[PDB]
Amino acid sequence: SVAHVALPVPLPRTFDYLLPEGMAVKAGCRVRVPFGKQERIGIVAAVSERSELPLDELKPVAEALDDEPVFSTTVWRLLMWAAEYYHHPIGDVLFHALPVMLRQGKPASATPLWYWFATEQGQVVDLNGLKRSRKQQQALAALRQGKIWRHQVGELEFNEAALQALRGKGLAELACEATDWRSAYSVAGERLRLNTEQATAVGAIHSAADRFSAWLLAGITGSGKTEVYLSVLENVLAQGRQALVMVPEIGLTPQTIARFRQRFNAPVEVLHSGLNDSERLSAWLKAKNGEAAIVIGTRSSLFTPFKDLGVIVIDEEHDSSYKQQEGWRYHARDLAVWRAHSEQIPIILGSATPALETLHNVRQGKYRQLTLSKPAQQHVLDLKGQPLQAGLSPALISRMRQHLQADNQVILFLNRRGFAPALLCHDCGWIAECPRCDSYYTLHQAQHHLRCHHCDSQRPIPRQCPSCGSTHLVPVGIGTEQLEQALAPLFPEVPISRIDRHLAAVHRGGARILIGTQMLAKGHHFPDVTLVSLLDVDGALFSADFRSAERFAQLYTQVSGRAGRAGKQGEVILQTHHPEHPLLQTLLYKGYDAFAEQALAERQTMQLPPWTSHVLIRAEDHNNQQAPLFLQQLRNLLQASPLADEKLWVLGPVPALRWQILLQHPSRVRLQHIVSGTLALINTLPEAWVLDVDPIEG
Ligand SMILES: Nc1ncnc2c1ncn2[C@@H]1O[C@H](COP(=O)(O)OP(=O)(O)O)[C@@H](O)[C@H]1O
Ligand SMILES: [Zn+2]
Ligand SMILES: [Zn+2]
């Protein structure tokens, strides 16, 4: 009688409509409803016999677009929970989970694809006639060889006009075409690749395959993590169940795709960024109907429906790209784990450098670890008192030339762009710390001051180091200053190129300097690189962002096993003003896992994630000012709201690395409800504003 309908609007509620008699429609189905004078597509959240709004103002539902729900029960429950946890409007959440074509109210069914083909006559006709009809002979000559899809005519030189003219002469016609892989699926033969550790990992996952279990597959690069994924998948597909494989945004390489395609005598569906809406819907349907054995995709592939999902694999579990930074700011990994729990299936998280969140979860009961085991010389250069050219010390340049004149490649790594730096003395290594809290000052040269972020303290930029008297105070964490402009005159006629995602000149080998700011794609290798230098180690060690050391440790550990693998002797050089920094020392001589153990214990002392939960609230006001006051009002509304516990820790209005406030709490659930209540009632009108649960900051 009454349908509670969700719309793709920035409002956290459902609009009511009347259900005319005869119109069958459950929750999870799409509807066409009136909205003002115009018309809108919506989703039925709930169907009640009851009454909610003024009954007379209730307009009826214009059309029921789906007979059956477009989300499954567990996926539906997942999205309901995600909306509650991320505090994002239920309508936007639900519509974001659907393909574009289904958002627009089109049928949830596979569109037929049509082709032109040469008729019986067109195959034999004297090619002496069309020799005066312009494009039609070219159109038919192509048709002689094979069919031509309609969505490909635009890539050719003859058009639909040339083809429809052949149609009228009876020489071309239009037709379209109509699938069970489980029968005739060969589990492959005993072929016996797996080693001891690999087989144990496969066995352990197999022995618990009929329930939920979150596994961390922790192994260094080359240990054969992918090989375990492939074997696990074989078992799952042997049960006639489907699989989802998630990779980072840059992970869908032709080599990776070919690897999966060749291993499985079963359909593999790849959700890459080049697909159009039809192709995406087609893939969505193939998965929903159980026709796709394996789906490979990136962050959004999490929302794909499955007739019978049997396993989830997330490769490069630590990658940032699993966190959506625009609109609905969900984390694909967490939601995937949630999805695995509700469906009661295994999820396998794979990384050579697992997130601290993940290692914490393993240390506690949450995840189970399966480990895989099975040279590169490293130098630490002291920048203190060194005359730099392009941020490069004499010692590094000396090593660089010895690699370049040997006709080899060199990679330099930097700290992206836009990040706000710390300030230190180039001569004695003094760092600007806040006097109140032991926290590094963030340098704001555009604002002419140093600002604390753990507390809120103002201090002007010193002209000289107060410790040693030197004027050579430098900003650390700046690499956007077009390094090539200084590298070209330092390295004459040597080609300079950027890695960050035509550039097949890298595969040519020879003397070359490569510049990167982010971690490299899986399988994507640089065999001609024999020297890797990590510039601005200080930017990572003295950042206001508490996760910078983690990201650096990951970057360092990745690139530590890519300096010309097996073939040539690789060299890793790090430049820093503090060579004997304890954290850095642990990383360099003990490895990532030991860094992680120490970093994790320091997170506990400082009461930081993953030991606590975080929620950010950002604001962007043109007014540069007043906006902090809006957050000041929101701070006070957050104070006395039921649930104080003298555990809730709120950072007052502090500018970002744009303004923000920070909420911290030992309990994830409690912090959710504190935000739930404070957002339920909002007092002053918002003109300035986003909400970020579990922020990765970067
Ligand atoms: N046991 C193996 N079988 C096949 N290929 C392997 C094996 N070990 C390593 N490789 C190759 O080395 C690269 C990285 O190893 P991979 O098996 O993907 O493990 P990981 O996922 O830990 O990097 C891949 O490109 C892969 O082709
Ligand atoms: Zn401070
Ligand atoms: Zn000094």
Considering every ligand atom, which ligand is closest to the CA of 259? 1
Alpha helices in 50-130 (DSSP H): 73-85, 90-96, 100-103
Considering every ligand atom, which ligand is closest to the CA of 385? 3
CA 226 to ligand 1 center in whole angstroms: 6
| Selection from 301, 257, 380, 323 nearest residue 609 by Cα | 323
Contact 516, 409 (CB under 8 A): no
CATH superfamily of the 179-374 domain: P-loop containing nucleotide triphosphate hydrolases (3.40.50.300)
The protein residue with its alpha carbon nearest to ligand 1, atom 15, reads 222
Coil vs helix vs strand at 498: strand
Q: Method used for this model? A: X-ray
**Does 603 show up as a binding residue in the annotation?**
no
The separation between CA 164 and the C-alpha centre of its own chain, rounded to angstroms, equals 45
CA 633 to ligand 1 center in whole angstroms: 54
What is d(CA 532, CA 571) in angstroms, rounded to the nearest whole number?
Answer: 6
Contact 630, 682 (CB under 8 A): no
Query: What's the resolution in A?
Result: 2.7
CA 431 to ligand 2 center in whole angstroms: 14
Per-residue tokens: 319: 């990658």
Phi, psi of 673 (to 5 degrees): -75, -30
| Selection from 631, 625, 623 nearest residue 651 by Cα | 631
What is d(CA 304, CA 295) in angstroms, rounded to the nearest whole number?
Answer: 8
Q: In the structure, which protein residues have their CB atom closer than 6 angstroms to any atom of ligand 1?
A: 193, 219, 221-227, 523
What is d(CA 555, CA 518) in angstroms, rounded to the nearest whole number?
Answer: 8
What single-letter amino acid sits at 21?
A: E
**Does 225 show up as a binding residue in the annotation?**
yes
C-alpha distances out from residue 328 to 246, 660, 682, Å: 19, 18, 20
What is d(CA 450, CA 140) in angstroms, rounded to the nearest whole number?
Answer: 73
Contact 570, 508 (CB under 8 A): no
| Selection from 276, 244, 327 nearest residue 99 by Cα | 276
**Does 176 show up as a binding residue in the annotation?**
no
Packed helices 225-238 and 254-263: angle between N→C axes, nearest 10 degrees: 40
C-alpha distances out from residue 139 to 156, 164, 165, 176, 375, Å: 9, 10, 10, 19, 60
What is d(CA 454, CA 357) in angstroms, rounded to the nearest whole number?
Answer: 21
- The residue ranges of every structural domain in the chain are 1-111, 112-178, 179-374, 375-416+482-608, 417-481, 609-698
Considering every ligand atom, which ligand is closest to the CA of 263? 1
The protein residue with its alpha carbon nearest to ligand 1, atom 2, reads 224
Residue 577: CB partners within 8 Å, gap ≥ 6? 382, 383, 384, 424, 426, 429, 476, 538
For residue 222, the ligand 1 atom closest to its alpha carbon is: 15
The three-state DSSP-derived secondary structure of 308-350 is CEEEEEEECCCCHHHECCCCCCCEHHHHHHHHHHHHCCEEEEE
Considering every ligand atom, which ligand is closest to the CA of 197? 1
Q: Which helix (H) or strand (E) holds 637?
A: helix 627-639
The protein residue with its alpha carbon nearest to ligand 1, atom 27, reads 523
Packed helices 332-343 and 73-85: angle between N→C axes, nearest 10 degrees: 140
What is d(CA 173, CA 162) in angstroms, rounded to the nearest whole number?
Answer: 12
* Maximum CA extent, the chain: 94
Q: Which of 202, 225, 226, 565 to mutate to test the pocket of ligand 1 (most atoms within 8 A of CB)?
A: 226
What is d(CA 490, CA 654) in angstroms, rounded to the nearest whole number?
Answer: 41
Q: Which of 227, 247, 261 to mutate to test the pocket of ligand 1 (most atoms within 8 A of CB)?
A: 227
Domains 1-111 and 179-374 share a fold: no
CA 609 to ligand 2 center in whole angstroms: 19
DSSP E strands in 36-176: the ranges are: 38-48, 63-64, 114-118, 148-149, 172-176
User: For residues 70, 73, 77 and 82, what is the CA-based torsion angle, rounded to 10 degrees?
Assistant: -40
What single-letter amino acid sits at 148?
A: I
The protein residue with its alpha carbon nearest to ligand 1, atom 18, reads 226
Contact 545, 657 (CB under 8 A): yes
DSSP 320: G
Phi, psi of 336 (to 5 degrees): -60, -45
Contact 645, 670 (CB under 8 A): yes
What is d(CA 176, CA 15) in angstroms, rounded to the nearest whole number?
Answer: 41
What is d(CA 189, CA 601) in angstroms, rounded to the nearest whole number?
Answer: 47
**Does 222 show up as a binding residue in the annotation?**
yes
Residues paired with 42 in a beta bridge: 31
What is d(CA 517, CA 390) in angstroms, rounded to the nearest whole number?
Answer: 16
Q: Which residue has the tokens 């999205």?
A: 79
CATH class of 1-111: alpha beta
